[PDB]
Write a protein that binds this ligand. Structure first.
Ligand SMILES: Nc1nc2c(ncn2[C@@H]2O[C@H](COP(=O)(O)OP(=O)(O)NP(=O)(O)O)[C@@H](O)[C@H]2O)c(=O)[nH]1
Ligand SMILES: [K+]
Ligand SMILES: [Mg+2]
Ligand SMILES: [Mg+2]
Ligand SMILES: [Mg+2]
Ligand SMILES: [Mg+2]
Length: 325
RNA sequence: UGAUCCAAUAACUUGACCAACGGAACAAGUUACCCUAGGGACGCAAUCCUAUUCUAGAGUCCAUAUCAACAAUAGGGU
């Protein structure tokens, strides 16, 4: 939640010298550099104006000619930055410190072709995305116990985010519990789609589905757990087809319910034969393809049931992916 | 528009980029090889750009933006 935007303008060139024929210095260029220890919010509250202008090329003197280029401006940003344009096209990616990208060029100097005038520079507007998502991304409906699952899986974490799963080998698996996955995603692509843009940069997806189904209101449709999974798959297909290529695991929560066993059995039957029930949904709700789950585990966030096995399965799946790649 | 002297002429008259123009009849460079007598240590305009301000207009919504015509003064060049 830190999407940024700046206005950049390269300085104009240098005024040439007509009688002799001297060129003026080229205008300063606009560059963005990757540095650590600072964040996008840090940049914003350092420079509230959000505008960067480089130097201006020196005019053509008579002691010297072909003037020196103006002092370029360097814009510091953190690592893992995606720089795009106002149209959203990705200008570049800065993944390591000292990565430098030119965004706006300075104006040319005062050549005779331009009547020795210092041609103006470039005006551009750039966007910043400080989002390099973790390896595991949690996807779940509201109240589907994503925060509770994160709190249970972490030694100590606030369940209202990013957390780490610790192993005996002192290995940490970086997980991201993303709230508001369904903030009218089918209707508000303005806010519930930044969630999908953040989650798209994750290697593994963990869907968390409540066993007791879900319902927004008494006047809203009661969708079962299988219906919730189908809705998740349809939303993923609508958002980005390439996201489904990543490995996905399923976790049916709230096993402490009295009917949880029968509900999970029914859900497993539906998973085994989904084609027999896909007609019940409209053609809009029918996904282009069905997501295959490497593992589906029943878990309970209250009784701390199956969490160790889920962590072991996640580690094994990550190891298998690494070995394959 | 040019004095004296001087020159020509029987006479009346005449002669000066003497222009350094109150005009010496006619005389140049270089000296670190030097010498002597002395004295001292800005505005006016057109144009092009930018530092700071206002905003006619354009879009801006989503823990996610603003740019900015015309001006206003402060300065740099042609
Ligand atoms: N009985 C029972 N209650 C559970 C279980 N898991 C979660 N809960 C309860 O259900 C609620 C979950 O709320 P919350 O932590 O906000 O989950 P969430 O999915 O992150 N909600 P949101 O997506 O809106 O942020 C809590 O009251 C929690 O105690 C479970 O396995 N069993
Ligand atoms: K004289
Ligand atoms: Mg939560
Ligand atoms: Mg005199
Ligand atoms: Mg007199
Ligand atoms: Mg000598």
């Amino acid at each position: 939640i830190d999407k940024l935007r700046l206005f950049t303008r390269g300085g104009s060139g240098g005024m040439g010298y007509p009688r002799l024929g001297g060129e003026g210095g080229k205008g300063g260029d606009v560059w963005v550099v990757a540095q650590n220890r600072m964040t996008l919010k840090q940049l914003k509250d350092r420079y509230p104006r959000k505008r960067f202008v480089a130097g201006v090329g020196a005019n053509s003197k008579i002691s010297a000619l072909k003037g020196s280029k103006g002092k370029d401006c360097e814009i510091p940003v953190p690592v893992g930055i995606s720089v795009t344009d106002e149209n959203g096209k990705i200008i570049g990616e800065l993944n390591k410190e000292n990565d430098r990208i030119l965004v706006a060029q300075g104006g040319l100097g005062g050549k005779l072709l331009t009547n020795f005038l210092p041609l103006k520079g470039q005006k551009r507007i750039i966007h910043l995305d400080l989002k390099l998502i973790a390896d595991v991304g949690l996807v779940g409906f509201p109240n589907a116990g994503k925060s509770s699952l994160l709190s249970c899986v972490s030694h100590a974490k606030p369940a209202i985010e990013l957390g780490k799963i610790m192993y005996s080998d002192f290995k940490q698996i970086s997980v991201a519990d993303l709230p508001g996955l369904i903030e009218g995603a089918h209707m508000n692509k303005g806010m519930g789609h930044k969630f999908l843009k953040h989650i798209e940069r994750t290697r593994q997806l963990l869907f968390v589905v409540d066993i007791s189904g879900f319902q927004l209101s008494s006047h809203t449709q009661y969708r079962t757990a299988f219906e919730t999974i189908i809705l998740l798959t349809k939303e993923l297909e609508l958002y980005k087809e390439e996201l489904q290529t990543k490995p996905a695991l399923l976790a049916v929560n709230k096993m402490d319910l009295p009917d949880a066993q029968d509900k999970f059995h029914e859900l497993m039957s539906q998973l085994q034969n989904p084609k027999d029930f896909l007609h019940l949904f409209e053609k809009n709700m029918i996904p282009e393809r069905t997501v295959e789950f490497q593992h589906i585990i029943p878990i309970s966030a209250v009784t701390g049931e199956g969490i160790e096995e889920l962590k072991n399965c996640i580690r094994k799946s990550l190891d298998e992916q690494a070995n394959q790649e």
